[PDB]
Symmetry: D3
Subunit: 134 residues, 6 copies
Amino acid sequence: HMSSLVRRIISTAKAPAAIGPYSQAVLVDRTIYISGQLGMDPASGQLVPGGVVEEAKQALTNIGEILKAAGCDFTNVVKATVLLADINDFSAVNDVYKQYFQSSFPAAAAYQVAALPKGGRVEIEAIAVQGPLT
Amino acid sequence: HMSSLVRRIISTAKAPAAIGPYSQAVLVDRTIYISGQLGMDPASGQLVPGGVVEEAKQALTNIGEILKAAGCDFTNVVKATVLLADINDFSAVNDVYKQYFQSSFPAAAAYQVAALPKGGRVEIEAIAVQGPLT
Amino acid sequence: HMSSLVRRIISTAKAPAAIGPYSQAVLVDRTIYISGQLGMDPASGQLVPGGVVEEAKQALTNIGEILKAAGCDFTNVVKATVLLADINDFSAVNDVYKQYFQSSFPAAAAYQVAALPKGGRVEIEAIAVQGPLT
Amino acid sequence: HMSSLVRRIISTAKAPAAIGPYSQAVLVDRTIYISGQLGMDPASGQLVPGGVVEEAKQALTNIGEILKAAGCDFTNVVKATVLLADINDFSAVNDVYKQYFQSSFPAAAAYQVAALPKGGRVEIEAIAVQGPLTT
Amino acid sequence: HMSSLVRRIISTAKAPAAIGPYSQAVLVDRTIYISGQLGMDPASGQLVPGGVVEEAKQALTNIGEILKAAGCDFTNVVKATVLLADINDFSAVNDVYKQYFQSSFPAAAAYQVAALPKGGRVEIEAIAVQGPLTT
Amino acid sequence: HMSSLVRRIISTAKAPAAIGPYSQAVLVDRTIYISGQLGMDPASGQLVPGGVVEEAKQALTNIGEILKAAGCDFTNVVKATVLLADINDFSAVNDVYKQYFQSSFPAAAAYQVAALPKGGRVEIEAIAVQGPLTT
């Protein structure tokens, strides 16, 4: 009696696989729920060296590759969550995010957690909506 | 001038009541926002004994009962958040989640928080979409 | 080949500006993703004095002003996340939330984080849906 | 990739059996396309006696039963077409029609055709939208 | 449980008053069903003089005012039906019609009926969709 | 503020060129309004010989090519209108029609008009909905 909505798992070899029985992202109707991305190199399965700035760059690259696999780019992001091992890294992570966001300004929440998977210093979750968007 | 979308509070006696002025879940349009579930026994109002594995089983059972009250099951879950008191319990919680998920693979984020309500070792939030889904 | 959905940035001078390259909220289709709000006075750019109860009041006022800028009020909220510097403040924050929620009962998650931006004791994120709603 | 929309054939034995390769109505998404109804008795398939006024009443009754089978009533109708064998019957058929469409009057077109199946004096087609509808 | 769709009667004094139990148009969700319009002067309710060409212009003007009341213009029309008293007028009415539907031409059907209300020579019905529409 | 719905003109050289200011079909959101088709050969624009049965086959073939251009087939049709030059041809045209609409029969109206363009014996209009449709 109701319409059947499209639900698609998004998969790309250009981002790491999720840790656990999870997908990199799920598109449902037009909304894309992207799993939290760490600064993990898809080729090594481990964090990139060099600390939070390098990890933020890698995490955002990983998000970007998942967005591309769903026909999207950073302009489609509507909400991000920035999870930090150290609140004092917030500015530095925001400076990296400003380099990837294609001038988009999604809503966001940010906070320091007690620990991230793989000893990460940053993890970014995102929600996007498939275009076209006004 | 715009359509009136369906918004329904989901309530079931087979899951604990939310802590505070919150509902167990809200269905709006076709999206179900499920409150974070702890390993609380609906009959005792307290955590089940035995630690994080037992609590994860109870939390997932609680999610399952809320999904059922909304006409859904684990195949409808599109995003989960796994909140942990100890990051080292992530694998063990993922092994329990693999027992309940009906082979679904939602998007996910996971991290260790400083503390959960009721001294919980695990809390799981979920977003589902009411079917049919492709 | 697909409809173009409305995406609008919500901005109001009656709430503080977001910290970083983010918007106060984004409306997309009918869903409003509200950035996490701290107990920051829009006039000072700093936390209000007096502790978590005062900060919770200010954070909720800030959410309320963002909702109003999107044509909504607290009855439109469907999911909240209550982030705390101290889990022991959960009841006190819930008592403030009960004063602002216009009897709405959204789904919710709550937990203690390691740290919030600006040394906040509380941060509240929300998802709302633009009415009319049944 | 696009959502799969609901498409259902509406069928009720309380409206006449088919006289051609046509469904009584088709619901698709929320819109209901109702076949043109004649003033035919549902049990026998024969036109009711009494001319255009009685045929109009029966045709509208038949539409009503099709609407009911789709979980609707006459308030769900948004467009009708009134096909007349004689334009002179315009006022008389309108008087019957107003008794069924008592509020939120549908959009309509009315005109005289050269002939209707079975020698009918009136045929009425309609489009409805499945509720809830907020007026 | 289903969403409650918007259904609104469209009414403007800039188009003729009703000659039957019909709304000028009904907007439902985003689709606008427009009643068949004759070449009737809105103030008097009398057909305009001059035959089919003038009646067509007036009928289209009336449609235009109904569209305007629904926040639309002729570019929102997606389907029309041109009902003629005389098939020979097909080309002449098409020449008038093309002056109003200047782009994104609607789908249409055109044919001769036996008679129209008020002795009209042309009646035009339409379906439109409320914008924004992305062509 | 409202979403911008897709509106596209459907056009195929495998169906006849226009005889008036009309699109072969208009897709809007998911609904396809198909212009009335005559039994016209697409290459020449001339009616096919053989009378109503052959004209019906050709008109339905033309609809089929328009549907194909919109990524649809006859199972996407939800409503048709069969306009006849002679009501006596009702049964014969229905026999042809059933060969194209072999399942999920559309809602329909059928009746005799006074005349069709080009002296046609039959004209068929349709509404379809772009799939996927779940019956």
